[PDB]
């Protein structure tokens, strides 16, 4: 099972671009892609070794990098342009498709704050068509700009059967906290840091968790709360991380509870104290779960690469995720009140709106029916 | 026949001369045309030594059941093959032979095919019938050309590399003896060969014998269409009499199904001589590697 | 225990009489600490028994993660025909074709994987396979047929359960463009992938672990066969299988509710309810009364459910 | 049995004269044309040694070459001159072919995007389908008013040559702008030089099977019309690990549906006894799909390296996907024949060309008999 990429925007460009330096030196692969002699499954993401990656002026950037050869602002221009080239950027991805022995899923990273916002939203649309059975993933990152943001989720909160919610105002924070930058050239290090470890499952095989199909079904329990956001604590035992994992100070997020946790431990820590710290969690309740349905935590081992301490991450499935979107659903009332039907983004404004009444009502001894 | 490049050679000149009976076939004659194949194929550049005892013999029907090679060898280096290995040797030498005359002959239909179809492509009404003449040959030559894989990986390649590793290792002449010996009980056993294997090696006999009723029912429907059109070249070049030939030609349409009925019947039987071999070899390990050359993409097992 | 050292690796490749002084039995332990030497280093450095008990653990313990998601994957349209009606000429085809493609070729010992249908289920198609692991003479003290059914037995254990929840989120697409099964999936998936969990991190891991350093400090082969049923009898005493039927009964809605959702009822949904959650409550009534097998409880709820 | 190439337009030529230079640095032949010191089979393409070519600007390039030693744009236009010089090259072609002790072929090297080379290449298939019946005709063509000399092409070549290589030049730029960084024709050429040497390497070097072009050709087409065969090409280590990645699209020169044939070519060193599992696995996973009405299966072959010159490999396959190409040209004429002395000869060769695309999408049928 191989996973197809996607690149839009600067944005897309940018992270991606980054995202395989990552990747490619967490393996022994040469900038030339060439292999480097210095047991990691690298078929998933690689095609014996060129990454399977479909991008769409930053791109002379990349051409001109050591990694040659590894290869308007509205969102009506974005989806309209994106109409104009439905047969040449689908011929692309249907070559991919078919030159792989059985496709998986889509990881497409894009910023829905200009033109990946509106050809990212008819994306998302086409691939419902033609490919009915495949996992679409996306790493959006989050900053007329109310109108191009909220545009996007109507498509991502119906065709996206996963997303992974990464906000540059708490990143900047980040940047600002432990780093003290002041620059988009660093935050992207950190960027970079949670979409490779994301995937560091797929890559190092273990007892599960073998394919993308199985870190989603387990965290997105219905098809509409299907929005997850990231912890990251090196900036030692396995409670020293997960107490840290839990404090929302790490988190990349500006009653309330969570709806399932997936951590992953990158060391070299024992199998055997692993219990041991799911037993305090629970004692001393550092979170707290939905009350209508069994929730329980999970964690998950890992293997760091020789060619390259204890490392973490947690996907998390919080309610408090819905704080983001009345940020967005506020100020277009705003500029609602302020200036061929104009009814699409009344159309998009009417189903937010039922999503984030269904996260208030995940809240409740009663969310069934 | 480990050279290839010479056995080619071989074959197409013994061609116009073993198809005679035995009778007017004498050994003095067949020397001058493998001294010539020797000259002319890569086997020239080799040691005269071992040229000098390359000969041919007669085996006591038709050409093609008496010929084959005997290497006849005696001295210091006779108490290796000891009058066994020249009795193993001639009995596999006929398997081979038999296997590549197989081949050659499913080449050559191949060949016509693709210089027939140059010259009676104006006929549409042949081409219903001549298409069962393909699919029936694709289908023959699949069988052949896969045991021919067979015989060169698993049988060939792969038991003599058990042979030149007990060699370069072994010494006192006693350890040579017993890996040349068992050398000889594999290629037996690999091959059809065997003593209680009977039952598989004349099961394969038939698919052997329906590849030449092919090749004799073949020409029999290609020629008699040359005929019926080299008549209706010539009966409008010479005039560019319309009524006593549209009868002739009526009746030319008429029997195309019958011919159709003939390849209509020998496919149905080729292939129930096949799905029953396949059954035979499930039985003694090493065949299980046959099976899967043959039914790969589960053309049959439906 | 000296010369024996000495010839499971010949085959591969003074003493006199006191009384009241010792001048002989002396001499023997410098002698069998050397027998021993050589044959111990011959195992780690070249042909590198703990270099030959990994392999094993990544298939019948189901380690190898790569391999397993691609098996299924290429022969499952062939386990779902009955017995006795699959050649094996067909499936040890898939499994040669699984290993080479997978990331499990890095592995010298891959080709002693063996396909054996059992005769009997866990007391078909699908409950009737199993790997079978042959092996040469000298190891064959340690790893025999005594010793490899119990392999074999923890091995179907863990393919059931890996099976269920392959298709059990399988399922999870198909419905993803009648809303009220969403909830109940969400009873099951977090009841396998939290025995899964249980049964892989905490449970063989552990065990494993221990048996990994039980074999640095070994002194004689007769405690090496004593570190290794040690280690197979308490997997098979942490794990359920050793009765508790009900776990094997509670598996069978789990798997034929995945075939209603495929068969695309309101009446049956809320059916599958009240029989599966009952079927659960059976299993912390029994899992509870004890005297590990309490930890397991906290494995199944967090969030306090399932307090009646 | 020898084979005669024939290299027509600057393309072939070009190509024609790097297979010549790749051929001669895998023997011991300088350029001078004479063997040098330093148990292949040369026979076959030299003549004792000069090589069995026939050359028809650039060749005023050639002959500034060091290997001196060694030896309009339409297509009516072509086909005119062509019919205008039958006899000149045709005593050249005869010679040539009456000195040969037995001939078995003719090779054509000619690119059908257009020029005087489409044409020529026409008029000299028919010719040969005339006077020499018993020859086959092996044609590495090289795929790119282009429309019309590109189908007309096609169109004579559906019929006479009795087999066909085909070489998209889109694919091989895109090769070289993926793992090559170009941004030229003297490196693209490179590889098709590669591919072409490749090619024909089992007869050169004798192996158990695979000793002369019929035993390529009867193995691969099943029928006189599914005579089309695409290659890849994946050194750019196991058997395995070769045969996975030359399944792969990523290397196929090739811009529902399966296969029809497939041959496999290695020249390394390695163990020939792991090749059997690599098709069992192969097998098993089920990477790649076959035709459902007759029994089609993988044929792989070994051989030997140049010692004067590491595993590679190479494959030919029919695929059925190749028509979508056609369908591209075809279309595009339809948009020509609607924009802009009987002009009804480019009708028949769209009518033809019709005929052969239907061909091949009811081939992919499991009822492609009848
Ligand atoms: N996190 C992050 N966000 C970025 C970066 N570069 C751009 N963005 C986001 O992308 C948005 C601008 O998108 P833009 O480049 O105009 O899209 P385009 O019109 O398709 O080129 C900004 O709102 C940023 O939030 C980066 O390096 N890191
Ligand atoms: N692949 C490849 N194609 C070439 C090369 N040189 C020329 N061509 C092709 O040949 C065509 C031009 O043919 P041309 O020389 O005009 O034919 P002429 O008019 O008979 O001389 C172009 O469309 C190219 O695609 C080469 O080096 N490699």
Not at chain 2, 212 to 231: K, P, S, T, V
Not at chain 3, 27 to 55: C, G, P, T, W
Request: charged residues 25%; aromatic residues 10%.
């Amino acid at each position: 099972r191989e996973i197809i990429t996607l690149q839009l925007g600067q944005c897309g460009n940018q992270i991606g671009f980054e995202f395989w330096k990552q990747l490619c030196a967490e393996h022994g692969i040469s900038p030339e892609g060439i292999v480097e002699e210095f047991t990691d499954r690298k078929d998933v993401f690689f095609y014996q070794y060129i990454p399977r990656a479909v991008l769409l002026r930053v791109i002379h950037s990349i051409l001109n990098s050591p990694y040659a050869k590894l290869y308007g602002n509205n969102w009506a221009s974005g989806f309209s342009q994106g109409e104009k080239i439905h047969e040449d950027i689908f011929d692309i991805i249907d070559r991919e498709a078919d030159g792989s022995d059985s496709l998986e899923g889509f990881v497409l990273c894009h910023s829905i704050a200009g033109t990946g916002s509106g050809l990212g939203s008819y994306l998302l649309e086409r691939l419902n068509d033609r490919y009915p059975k495949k996992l679409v993933q996306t790493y959006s990152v989050f900053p007329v700009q109310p109108y191009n943001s909220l545009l996007t989720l109507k498509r991502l909160t119906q065709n996206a059967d996963c997303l992974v919610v990464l906000d540059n105002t708490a990143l900047n924070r980040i940047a600002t906290d432990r780093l003290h930058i002041q620059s988009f050239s660093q935050i992207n290090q950190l960027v970079s840091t949670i979409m490779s470890a994301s995937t560091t499952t797929l890559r190092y095989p273990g007892y599960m968790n073998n394919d993308l199909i199985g870190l989603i079904a387990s965290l997105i329990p219905t098809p509409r709360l299907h929005f997850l956001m990231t912890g990251y604590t090196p900036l030692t035992t396995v409670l020293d991380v997960m107490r840290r994992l839990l404090q929302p100070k790490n988190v990349m997020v500006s009653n309330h509870c969570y709806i399932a946790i997936l951590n992953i431990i990158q060391g070299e820590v024992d199998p055997t104290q692993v219990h041991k710290s799911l037993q305090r969690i629970r004692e001393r309740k550092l979170a707290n779960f939905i009350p209508w349905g069994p929730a329980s935590i999970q964690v998950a081992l890992s293997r760091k690469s020789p060619y390259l301490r204890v490392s973490g991450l947690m996907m998390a499935n919080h309610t408090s995720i819905s704080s983001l979107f009345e940020r967005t659903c506020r100020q277009y009332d705003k500029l609602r009140k302020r200036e061929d039907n104009f009814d699409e983004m009344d159309t998009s404004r009417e189903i937010v709106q039922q999503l984030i009444d269904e996260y208030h009502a995940a809240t409740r001894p009663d969310y069934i029916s | 026949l480990g050279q290839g490049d010479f056995i080619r050679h071989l074959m197409d000149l013994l061609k116009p001369e073993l198809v005679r009976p035995a009778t007017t076939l004498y050994q003095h004659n067949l020397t001058g045309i493998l001294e010539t194949a020797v000259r002319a194929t890569n086997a020239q550049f080799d040691s005269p030594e071992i040229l000098r005892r390359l000969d041919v013999r007669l085996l006591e029907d038709t050409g093609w059941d008496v010929f084959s090679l005997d290497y006849h060898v005696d001295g210091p280096i006779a108490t290796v093959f000891t009058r066994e290995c020249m009795s193993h040797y001639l009995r596999v030498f006929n398997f081979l032979w038999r296997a590549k005359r197989m081949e050659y002959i499913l080449t050559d239909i191949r060949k016509g095919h693709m210089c027939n179809a140059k010259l009676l492509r104006n006929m549409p009404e042949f081409s219903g019938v001549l298409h069962q003449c393909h699919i029936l040959a694709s289908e023959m030559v699949h069988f052949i050309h896969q045991m021919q894989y067979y015989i060169t990986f698993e049988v060939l390649e792969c038991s003599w590399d058990e042979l030149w590793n007990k060699v370069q290792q072994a010494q006192d002449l006693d350890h040579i003896i017993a890996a040349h010996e068992v050398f000889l009980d594999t290629i037996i056993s690999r091959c059809l060969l065997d003593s209680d294997s009977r039952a598989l090696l004349n099961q394969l006999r038939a698919v052997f014998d329906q590849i030449i009723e092919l090749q004799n029912a073949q020409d029999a429907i290609y020629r008699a269409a040359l005929e019926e059109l080299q008549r209706r070249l010539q009966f409008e070049e010479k005039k560019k009499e319309e009524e006593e030939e549209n009868k002739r030609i009526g009746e030319f349409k008429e029997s195309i199904p019958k011919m159709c009925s003939q390849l209509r019947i020998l496919t149905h039987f080729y292939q129930g001589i096949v799905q029953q071999f396949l059954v035979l070899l499930t039985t003694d390990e090493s065949l299980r590697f046959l099976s899967f050359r043959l039914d790969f993409n589960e053309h049959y097992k439906a | 225990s000296t010369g024996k050292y000495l010839n499971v690796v010949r085959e591969c490749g003074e003493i006199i009489y006191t009384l009241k002084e010792r001048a002989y039995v002396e001499q023997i332990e410098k002698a069998f600490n050397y027998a021993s030497k050589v044959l111990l280093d011959f195992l780690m450095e070249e042909k590198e028994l703990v270099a030959h008990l990994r392999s094993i653990k990544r298939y019948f313990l189901m380690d190898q993660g790569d391999f397993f998601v691609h098996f299924m994957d290429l022969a499952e349209e062939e386990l779902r025909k009955p017995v006795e009606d699959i050649t094996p000429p067909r499936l040890e085809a898939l499994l040669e074709l699984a290993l080479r493609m997978s990331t499990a070729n890095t592995d010298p010992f891959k080709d002693d994987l063996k396909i054996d249908l059992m005769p009997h289920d866990l007391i078909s198609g699908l409950e009737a396979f199993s790997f079978d692991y042959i092996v040469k003479w000298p190891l064959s003290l340690i790893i025999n047929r005594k010793a490899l059914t119990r392999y074999q037995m923890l091995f179907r254990h863990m393919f059931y359960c890996k099976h269920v929840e392959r298709q059990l989120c399988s399922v999870w697409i198909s419905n993803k463009t009648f809303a009220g099964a969403f909830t109940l999936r969400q009873r099951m998936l977090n009841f396998v992938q939290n025995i899964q969990y249980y049964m892989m991190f905490e449970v063989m891991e552990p065990t494993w672990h221990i048996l990994e350093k039980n074999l640095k400090s070994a002194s004689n082969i007769d405690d090496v066969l004593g570190h290794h049923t040690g280690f197979l009898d308490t997997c098979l005493k942490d794990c359920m299988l050793t009765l508790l039927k009900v776990f094997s009964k509670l598996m069978s809605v789990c798997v034929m509710f995945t075939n209603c959702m495929q068969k695309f009822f309101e009446a049956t949904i809320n059916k599958f309810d009240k029989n599966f959650s009952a079927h659960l409550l059976d299993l912390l009534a029994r899992l509870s009364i004890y005297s590990g097998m309490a930890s397991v409880i906290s494995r199944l709820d967090f969030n306090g459910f399932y307090t009646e």
